[PDB]
Amino acid sequence: KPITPHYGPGHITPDWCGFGDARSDCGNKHTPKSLDIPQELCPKFSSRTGSSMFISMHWNNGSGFDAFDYSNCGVEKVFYEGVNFSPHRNYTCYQEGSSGWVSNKVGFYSKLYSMASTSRCIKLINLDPPTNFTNYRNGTCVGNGGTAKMPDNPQLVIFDAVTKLSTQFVLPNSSDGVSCTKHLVPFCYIDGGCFEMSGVCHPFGYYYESPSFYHGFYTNGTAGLHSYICDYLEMKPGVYNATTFGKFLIYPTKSYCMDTMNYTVPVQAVQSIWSENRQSDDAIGQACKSPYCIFYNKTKPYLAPNGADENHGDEEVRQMMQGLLVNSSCVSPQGSTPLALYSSEMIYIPNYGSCPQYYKLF
Amino acid sequence: KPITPHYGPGHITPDWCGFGDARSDCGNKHTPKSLDIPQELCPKFSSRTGSSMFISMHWNNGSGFDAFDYSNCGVEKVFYEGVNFSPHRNYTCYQEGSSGWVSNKVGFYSKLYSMASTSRCIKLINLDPPTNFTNYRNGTCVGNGGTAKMPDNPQLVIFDAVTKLSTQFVLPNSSDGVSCTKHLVPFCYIDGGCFEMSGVCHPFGYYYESPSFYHGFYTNGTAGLHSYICDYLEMKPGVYNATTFGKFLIYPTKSYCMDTMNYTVPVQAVQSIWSENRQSDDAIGQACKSPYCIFYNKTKPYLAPNGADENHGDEEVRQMMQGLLVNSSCVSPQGSTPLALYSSEMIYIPNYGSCPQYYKLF
Ligand SMILES: CO[C@]1(C(=O)O)C[C@H](OC(C)=O)[C@@H](NC(C)=O)[C@H]([C@H](O)[C@H](O)COC(C)=O)O1
Ligand SMILES: CO[C@]1(C(=O)O)C[C@H](OC(C)=O)[C@@H](NC(C)=O)[C@H]([C@H](O)[C@H](O)COC(C)=O)O1
Ligand SMILES: *[C@@H]1O[C@H](CO)[C@@H](O)[C@H](O)[C@H]1NC(C)=O
Ligand SMILES: *[C@@H]1O[C@H](CO)[C@@H](O)[C@H](O)[C@H]1NC(C)=O
Ligand SMILES: *[C@@H]1O[C@H](CO)[C@@H](O)[C@H](O)[C@H]1NC(C)=O
Ligand SMILES: *[C@@H]1O[C@H](CO)[C@@H](O)[C@H](O)[C@H]1NC(C)=O
Ligand SMILES: *[C@@H]1O[C@H](CO)[C@@H](O)[C@H](O)[C@H]1NC(C)=O
Ligand SMILES: *[C@@H]1O[C@H](CO)[C@@H](O)[C@H](O)[C@H]1NC(C)=O
Ligand SMILES: *[C@@H]1O[C@H](CO)[C@@H](O)[C@H](O)[C@H]1NC(C)=O
Ligand SMILES: *[C@@H]1O[C@H](CO)[C@@H](O)[C@H](O)[C@H]1NC(C)=O
Ligand SMILES: *[C@@H]1O[C@H](CO)[C@@H](O)[C@H](O)[C@H]1NC(C)=O
Ligand SMILES: *[C@@H]1O[C@H](CO)[C@@H](O)[C@H](O)[C@H]1NC(C)=O
């Protein structure tokens, strides 16, 4: 008798973990009303209310960002966070705007998901400060009247005068138990031609370099609309330099330390949005693509009649997350299944485990 | 009764294609003795003797390179070429050496395979020349006593004097029937500090730029060992600029035009090596990784007792390629299968179609 796949995330072995926010945080005071997952699964998630893996990449606690030291391990992974950086946040650093930050948001989540698929542990870590330099200013945002905090990672600096400089930062091989066989490191820049400071238009740019690596940005065109853009990089542990072109420089202060597993396993991401009376985005949906990530989209609006509030407790997702209670045998875009011979609908890729074949073929 | 998967490439639907070299070229005079595939499958392959998709990316006919206008379409793809650029070629442009070109080789094949997995057609195309410029030299190799041809793509140029310049190149939306919804474009540079020309050490670097794109390289350190390194880029059709920092500039003269299909399907690559009395590399094996590419490695040496010569006709691969004669129902790392209920061994990912489950689970 053919089994119907249960739409939502699953796991085939005890060795899975989740990553999330308030909707998976049993430390939040509204528990279990604010959950979108089963309560006995909280210990499998690494989650903090108000945070997201995107925020935590860029900011420390402060100026409205709630940061979190995300850390977990699992062959199989369930990602359910992101909404805490949506257009609703109304953030911008220069003139990139919200849509500009949806662009950054996709870039990050795209890199994280694909890197995660070849990893078991993911650990946000603090990098040691670079070799000291002097006569410098930290970068600042003009966005939101100068109240928008430019990220703590990567850290921007501005030299009082044009200068020749290269500075050393370290991406470690390990962080307290975990192996960092690779790192997810942000490289952000401001585009749109030369950058105006005190009536002088300086060429904007700098680079990450080492003997086996290079990533850079440069511009000295006619000034126009400036955008704070981020690239997200896979960098191997080791010693790197950050080099200026004269006036500007960034160094990373944080990375996502990740190890490596030989068998690659698609991650799972569930849609993280707000109620309809708040601006959401489809970054997760755009970032979580085949074949490295399995996307479970919400068909309905965010509706929580039995939750703590209109944004915490959604019926749809609660139903999806029910699948993480059963030791499944197949994890697919169509959902999870137990070990069975036939299926009620075609299983498509990316999948893994042992999946039933479509009955109508037999 | 459980079926054993046939180790090697397969196809589930008539809509597959191959990409290859002499070992899949029915135009070569040694046919069918020099083939590694079934002869009636030649019409499915796009192949030229002595060529490879890596060579064709970088060179026109001449100076020992045999170029080919590779072009094919298929939901499912079988890649079997590469050996015509192995360490055996003894090529180098600067001091990167053979291993340096194995590095370039991995980069290309890695990008091609993953891009191909989201495409149906792959077409090598010629780009229109950039807006004219003057007082310039084409770049040249020092490697092999100045007899090594620096690639025709991307084209390097050197300005007689330090200059401000930006030049326009076009990545088209279509090429005679096919849609180029994306392009695979090479961006190559020479690293190792400032570049010595006529007793002056110039900063080496330049960039590709547009309003929605940037890729660059720069260096002005102490001169050391110079290496010609390539990055391989996914760029959308449109108008781009190539900008210099003063002395150097590259523009692309070719790209791989590719369209987009919504369902992503892992490609298949078979090991392309020489006989043991020739230096091969494992670029294909390194480039063809899960989950975007399925690798069929050779367990044996290249042995062709019934071929045209020690390098054309291999027994092992000939046996693998037998699987492309049957309309399979499952394509896996373990090989192809027909539609069956059970399998003699565990099917692992990346796979696609409808695959039998491991008997020992039942
Ligand atoms: C502090 O005032 C200024 C300055 O003259 O330095 C004015 C300057 O704004 C003007 C009037 O051009 C502003 N730059 C830009 C491009 O918006 C510029 C930057 O916002 C500020 O210097 C911080 O820059 C970076 C890189 O973080 O700040
Ligand atoms: C033609 O002679 C020279 C020159 O003085 O211009 C000598 C120069 O070699 C010496 C003696 O430093 C060579 N540069 C390098 C780094 O090897 C340099 C380059 O090989 C040549 O200019 C081509 O350069 C590029 C970018 O293709 O060529
Ligand atoms: C931020 O502060 C909260 C309490 O406000 C605390 O639980 C947490 O440790 C902090 N986050 C980080 C990343 O330090
Ligand atoms: C962001 O702005 C919109 C309208 O512009 C508003 O509805 C929303 O409450 C604002 N959000 C915050 C957190 O201030
Ligand atoms: C800039 O910020 C860094 C990191 O947050 C901090 O350690 C340093 O004190 C700041 N420097 C200046 C000059 O404000
Ligand atoms: C940068 O651009 C400005 C305006 O085009 C020019 O005057 C200045 O000399 C340039 N600087 C460099 C280093 O090219
Ligand atoms: C996900 O769901 C929403 C609402 O149905 C839809 O608007 C959006 O386009 C979907 N995105 C993806 C990537 O499936
Ligand atoms: C190179 O020349 C061969 C014959 O030597 C010819 O078949 C082919 O068209 C040429 N290749 C390209 C890419 O023009
Ligand atoms: C490349 O060099 C090796 C030995 O250095 C030699 O065996 C081989 O024949 C050379 N290949 C060519 C094509 O000249
Ligand atoms: C440089 O090479 C290009 C492309 O092969 C060619 O069209 C041009 O004539 C060459 N220019 C010079 C100055 O040698
Ligand atoms: C490049 O480096 C050399 C040697 O360090 C220096 O003399 C020269 O002025 C530099 N040029 C630029 C544009 O930084
Ligand atoms: C492929 O096969 C050769 C010979 O058995 C081996 O040396 C090589 O490491 C293999 N590489 C991969 C990626 O499987």
Per residue, the 3-state secondary structure of A313-326, as one string, reads: CCHHHHHHHHHHHC
Collapse the DSSP code of B113 into the 3-class scheme (helix H, G, I; strand E, B; otherwise coil) and give the result. Answer: helix
Number of helices and strands (H, E) in chain A?
Answer: 5, 26
Phi, psi of B134 (to 5 degrees): -140, 170
> Please, are residues A227 and A177 in contact by the beta-carbon 8 Å criterion?
no
Instruction: Determine whether the interchain pair A355/B351 forms a contact, defined as Cβ–Cβ distance below 8 Å.
Output: no
Closest CA to B362 of B345, B347, B342, B348: B342
Task: Return d(Cα A136, Cα A244) in angstroms, integer.
Answer: 12
Collapse the DSSP code of B15 into the 3-class scheme (helix H, G, I; strand E, B; otherwise coil) and give the result. Answer: coil
- Go through A125-155 and write b for each residue having 16 or more CB atoms within 10 A of its CB, e for each that does not: bebeebeebeeeeebebebeeeebbbbbbbb
Task: Return d(Cα B111, Cα B215) in angstroms, integer.
Answer: 16
Phi, psi of A193 (to 5 degrees): 70, 180
Which of A76, A118, A214 should we substitute to test contact with B (largest number of B Cβ atoms within 10 Å)?
A: A214
Collapse the DSSP code of B100 into the 3-class scheme (helix H, G, I; strand E, B; otherwise coil) and give the result. Answer: helix
Closest CA to B353 of B330, B335, B325, B323: B330
Chain B partners within 8 Å of A350 (Cβ): 291, 349-350
Closest in A218, A264, A341 to B291, CB measured: A264
* Ligand 7, CB within 6 Å, residue ranges: A 282, 285, 297-299
> Please, are residues A269 and A113 in contact by the beta-carbon 8 Å criterion?
yes
Q: Is B69 in the pocket of ligand 8 (CB under 6 A)?
A: yes
> Please, are residues B213 and B254 in contact by the beta-carbon 8 Å criterion?
no
Radius of gyration of chain A from its Cα atoms, rounded to whole angstroms = 22
| Cβ neighbours for A82, distance < 8 A, ≥ 6 positions apart | A52, A53, A54, A105, A109, A272, A283, A284
Q: What is the token pair recorded at B252?
A: 């692309």
* Ligand 11, CB within 6 Å, residue ranges: B 194, 203, 220
Ligand number, closest to the Cα atom of B71: 8
Q: What is the token pair recorded at A315?
A: 């019926």
> Please, are residues B266 and B348 in contact by the beta-carbon 8 Å criterion?
no
* Length of chain B (residues): 362
Give distance in angstroms: CA of B157 to centre of ligand 10.
9
Q: What is the token pair recorded at A206?
A: 């700098």
Q: What is the token pair recorded at A296?
A: 């479970």
Give distance in angstroms: CA of A180 to centre of ligand 7.
34
Task: Return d(Cα B243, Cα B261) in angstroms, integer.
Answer: 33
Q: For the beta carbon of residue B60, count every other beta carbon within 10 angstroms.
A: 17
Give distance in angstroms: CA of A226 to centre of ligand 11.
28
Closest in A217, A350, A355 to B214, CB measured: A217
Q: Which residue of A has its CA nearest to B224?
A: A211
Per residue, the 3-state secondary structure of A122-171, as one string, reads: EEEEECCCCCCCCCEEECCCCHHHHCCCCCCCCEEEEECCCCCCEEEEEE
- Go through B318-345 and write b for each residue having 16 or more CB atoms within 10 A of its CB, e for each that does not: bebbbbbeeebbbbbbbbbbebbeebbb
Task: Return d(Cα B201, Cα A269) in angstroms, integer.
Answer: 51
> Can you say how many angstroms the Cα of residue A137 is from the centroid of all Cα atoms in its chain?
28
Containing B54, the helix (H) or strand (E) segment is helix B53-58
Closest CA to A305 of A273, A272, A275, A269: A275
Collapse the DSSP code of B231 into the 3-class scheme (helix H, G, I; strand E, B; otherwise coil) and give the result. Answer: strand
Task: Return d(Cα B323, Cα B328) in angstroms, integer.
Answer: 8
A297 CA closest ligand 7 atom index: 1
Collapse the DSSP code of B166 into the 3-class scheme (helix H, G, I; strand E, B; otherwise coil) and give the result. Answer: strand
Q: What is the token pair recorded at B353?
A: 């179609």
Q: Measuring CA to CA, how many Å separate A200 from each of A93, A145, B43, B117, B331?
A: 21, 21, 63, 48, 61
Give distance in angstroms: CA of B203 to centre of ligand 11.
7
Residue B309 DSSP one-character state: B
Parallel, antiparallel or unpaired: strands A166-171 and A238-244: antiparallel
Experimental technique used? X-ray
Q: What is the token pair recorded at B21?
A: 């070299």
> Please, are residues A290 and B264 in contact by the beta-carbon 8 Å criterion?
yes
Instruction: Determine whether the interchain pair A266/B207 forms a contact, defined as Cβ–Cβ distance below 8 Å.
Output: no
Q: What is the token pair recorded at A148?
A: 């928008």
| Cβ neighbours for A360, distance < 8 A, ≥ 6 positions apart | none
Q: Which residue has the tokens 């993280």?
A: A272
Task: Return d(Cα A20, Cα A25) in angstroms, integer.
Answer: 8
Burial (CB < 10 A; 0-12, 13-18, 19+), residue A218, is buried
Instruction: Determine whether the interchain pair A341/B341 forms a contact, defined as Cβ–Cβ distance below 8 Å.
Output: yes
Pocket test for ligand 8, best of B55, B68, B70, B71 (most atoms within 8 A of CB): B68
What distance in Å separates residue B349's CA from the closest CA in chain A?
7
CA nearest ligand 2 atom 26, residue: B139
> Please, are residues B293 and B287 in contact by the beta-carbon 8 Å criterion?
yes
Q: What is the token pair recorded at B33?
A: 């003795």
What residues does B331 pair with on adjacent strands? B336, B352
Q: Which residue has the tokens 């209670």?
A: A325
Chain A partners within 8 Å of B245 (Cβ): 218
Parallel, antiparallel or unpaired: strands B335-337 and B352-353: unpaired
Parallel, antiparallel or unpaired: strands A136-138 and A155-159: antiparallel
| Cβ neighbours for B267, distance < 8 A, ≥ 6 positions apart | B76, B77, B78, B79, B113, B116, B117, B288, B292, B293, B294
Whether the link from the prior residue into B38 is cis, omega within 30° of 0, is no
Task: Return d(Cα A309, Cα A321) in angstroms, integer.
Answer: 19
Helices (H), A214-305: 283-287
Closest CA to B145 of B200, B93, B190: B93
Collapse the DSSP code of B361 into the 3-class scheme (helix H, G, I; strand E, B; otherwise coil) and give the result. Answer: helix
Task: Return d(Cα B234, Cα B111) in angstroms, integer.
Answer: 8
Closest CA to B248 of B201, B215, B202, B208: B202
Chain B partners within 8 Å of A219 (Cβ): 209, 214
Task: Return d(Cα B335, Cα A66) in angstroms, integer.
Answer: 49
Chain A partners within 8 Å of B264 (Cβ): 289-291, 349
Angle (CA) A87 A191 A206, round 5°: 120
Task: Return d(Cα A186, Cα A182) in angstroms, integer.
Answer: 13
* Residues A47/A51/A55/A60 CA torsion (nearest 10 deg): -100
Task: Return d(Cα A126, Cα A122) in angstroms, integer.
Answer: 13
Containing B57, the helix (H) or strand (E) segment is helix B53-58
* Residues A59/A62/A65/A67 CA torsion (nearest 10 deg): 60
Q: Within 13 Å and on the Cβ side, how many CA atoms surround B274?
A: 14
Give distance in angstroms: CA of B206 to centre of ligand 6.
15
Chain B partners within 8 Å of A245 (Cβ): 218
Q: Which residue has the tokens 């010569």?
A: B309
Burial (CB < 10 A; 0-12, 13-18, 19+), residue B85, is buried
Angle (CA) A303 A112 A24, round 5°: 35
Task: Return d(Cα A231, Cα A6) in angstroms, integer.
Answer: 36
Chain B partners within 8 Å of A266 (Cβ): 291, 349
Give distance in angstroms: CA of B219 to centre of ligand 2.
16
